[PDB]
Amino acid sequence: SMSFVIWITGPSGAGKTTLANALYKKLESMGYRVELLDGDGVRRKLYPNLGFSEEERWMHNRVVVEMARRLSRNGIITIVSVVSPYRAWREYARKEIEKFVEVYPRCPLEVRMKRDPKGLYSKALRGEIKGLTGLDGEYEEPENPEVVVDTDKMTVEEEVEAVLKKLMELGYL
Amino acid sequence: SMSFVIWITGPSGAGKTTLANALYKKLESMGYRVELLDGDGVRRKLYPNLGFSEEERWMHNRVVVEMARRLSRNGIITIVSVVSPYRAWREYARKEIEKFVEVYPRCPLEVRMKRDPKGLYSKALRGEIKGLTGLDGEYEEPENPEVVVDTDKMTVEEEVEAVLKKLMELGYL
Ligand SMILES: Nc1ncnc2c1ncn2[C@@H]1O[C@H](COP(=O)(O)OP(=O)(O)NP(=O)(O)O)[C@@H](O)[C@H]1O
Numbered sequence A, B: 001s002m003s004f005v006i007w008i009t010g011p012s013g014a015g016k017t018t019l020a021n022a023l024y025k026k027l028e029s030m031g032y033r034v035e036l037l038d039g040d041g042v043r044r045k046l047y048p049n050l051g052f053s054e055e056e057r058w059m060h061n062r063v064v065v066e067m068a069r070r071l072s073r074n075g076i077i078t079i080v081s082v083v084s085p086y087r088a089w090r091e092y093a094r095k096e097i098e099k100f101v102e103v104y105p106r107c108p109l110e111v112r113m114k115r116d117p118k119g120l121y122s123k124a125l126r127g128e129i130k131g132l133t134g135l136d137g138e139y140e141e142p143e144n145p146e147v148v149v150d151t152d153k154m155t156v157e158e159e160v161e162a163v164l165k166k167l168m169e170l171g172y173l
C-alpha cells in the first residue's frame, strides 16, 4: 500500500525535469497514478519570492520531502525533480521516505552550458545571478544512487528504461 | 477518484484540532484513509521559525492548500486544522480544492480564554506574544461555511455528527 518516490537530483541543466516528465508519461501510460514535484514549479506556485541561500533552499526541500512522503505513503507514485545540492538533505529525504529511489543525471559542465534553454549559465557568467548550482554554486554528487544516468551519453528513452529496470529489480513495479 | 478536504478554520482555542482528531478517528474506524494537516504540526515539521506576520501565515497556508489539493485529487480524505484567518485565503483554498468542506468552530472569546491549555491567551495578555488570532489578532469569520458548530454549546461528538451529516448530504460519503 506504500508506494515509492523517484528523487531526481542534479545541477542546473543536468536534465532532471526532462527525465521526470518522460517517466510521468511512461508510468501513466501503464495505468499508474503519479504526482510530479518539480523544484521550479513548486517554487513559483508556493513561494516565488524565495531565494537561493542555503536556509531558503533547505526549507523548500523540506516542503518537497513532506509532500512526497504523504503522497507515497498513500499509494501514489511521486517523481521529484529538484536540485537538492547537499548530501545531508538527500539523506534526510531518504529517511523520511521508505521506498526512496535516488536518480542522478550526470552531465559534464561543458555540455550543461550548451544545454541551457533558460539562459541560467549565461546570466551567471555575466554576474547577473550568483552561486548557480553547477557553475559557481556547489553540488555534492551522490556516491551510490539507485540509478546514475549520463545525459551526455544516453537518450531520454534509455534513461527512462534504466529507471524502470531498477524499479522492477527493487520489486516496486 | 476525487476525494474531499475538511477545512477547519477558526481563532485560537476554537476547538479546531480537537474536532480534526475526532473526525480522523471516526472516519478511519469506518475504514477510510485519512491525512491530517494541523497548522501547529506542519509548522514545527517544515519551518518552526516561521513567524505570524500576514505574509508568513499566507505562505504556510499556501503550503497546506497545495498538500491538501494533491492528496484529495488522488482519493485521499484530508482534514486541515489551521487558523486561516482571512476570507481571501480560504477562498483561494476553495478554488484550489474541488470538494471543499469548510467547518467553523464558533466560540466566544470569554469561553476561548478559559479553554487555553497551551496558555496562548495568557502569554498574549501579558504582551509576551503579539497579534494572537482571537484576542488582538484579526479573524474574519466565515459567512456561510458548509458546517458551523458552536463549541460552547455542542459536544465534540455532536460536532462530528454534524460534519458527517453534511458530508452525506453532499454525496461525499
Ligand atoms: N539525454 C538528454 N540528451 C540530450 N539532451 C538532453 C537530454 N536531457 C535533457 N536534454 C536537454 O537538456 C536541457 C535541460 O534539461 P532540463 O530537464 O531542463 O534540466 P534540469 O536539470 O531540470 N535544469 P534546472 O531545472 O534549471 O535545474 C533541455 O533542453 C533538455 O531538453
Ligand SMILES: Nc1ncnc2c1ncn2[C@@H]1O[C@H](COP(=O)(O)OP(=O)(O)NP(=O)(O)O)[C@@H](O)[C@H]1O
Binding pocket: B010, B011, B012, B013, B014, B015, B016, B017, B018, B019, B040, B081, B083, B115, B116, B117, B120, B150, B151, B152, B154, B155, B156, B159
Ligand atoms: N466542543 C468542545 N466543548 C468543550 N470543550 C472543548 C470543545 N472542543 C475543544 N474543547 C477544548 O478546548 C481546548 C482547545 O481546543 P483545540 O482543539 O486545541 O483548539 P484550536 O482551535 O486547535 N487552538 P489553536 O491550535 O491554538 O489555534 C482544548 O482543551 C479542547 O479540549
Ligand SMILES: Nc1ncnc2c1ncn2[C@@H]1O[C@H](COP(=O)(O)OS(=O)(=O)O)[C@@H](O)[C@H]1O
Binding pocket: A011, A012, A013, A038, A039, A040, A043, A052, A056, A057, A058, A060, A061, A081, A082, A083, A084, A085, A120, A129, A130, A131, A132, A133, A137
Ligand atoms: N543561485 C541560483 N540562483 C538562481 N537559480 C538557481 C540557482 N541555483 C540553481 N538555480 C535554478 O533555480 C531552479 C529551481 O531550483 P531548485 O530545484 O528548487 O533548487 S534547490 O537547491 O532549492 O533544490 C532551478 O532551475 C535551478 O537550477
Ligand SMILES: Nc1ncnc2c1ncn2[C@@H]1O[C@H](COP(=O)(O)OS(=O)(=O)O)[C@@H](O)[C@H]1O
Binding pocket: B011, B012, B013, B038, B039, B040, B043, B052, B056, B057, B058, B060, B061, B081, B082, B083, B084, B085, B129, B130, B131, B132, B133, B137
Ligand atoms: N500571533 C500568534 N502568535 C503565536 N501563535 C499564534 C498566533 N496566532 C495564532 N497562533 C497559534 O499558533 C498555532 C499554529 O497556527 P496556524 O494554524 O498555522 O495559524 S495560521 O494563521 O498560520 O493559519 C496555533 O496554535 C495558533 O493559534
Ligand SMILES: [Mg+2]
Binding pocket: A016, A017, A018, A040, A081
Ligand atoms: Mg528543471
Ligand SMILES: [Mg+2]
Binding pocket: B016, B017, B018, B040, B081
Ligand atoms: Mg490547534
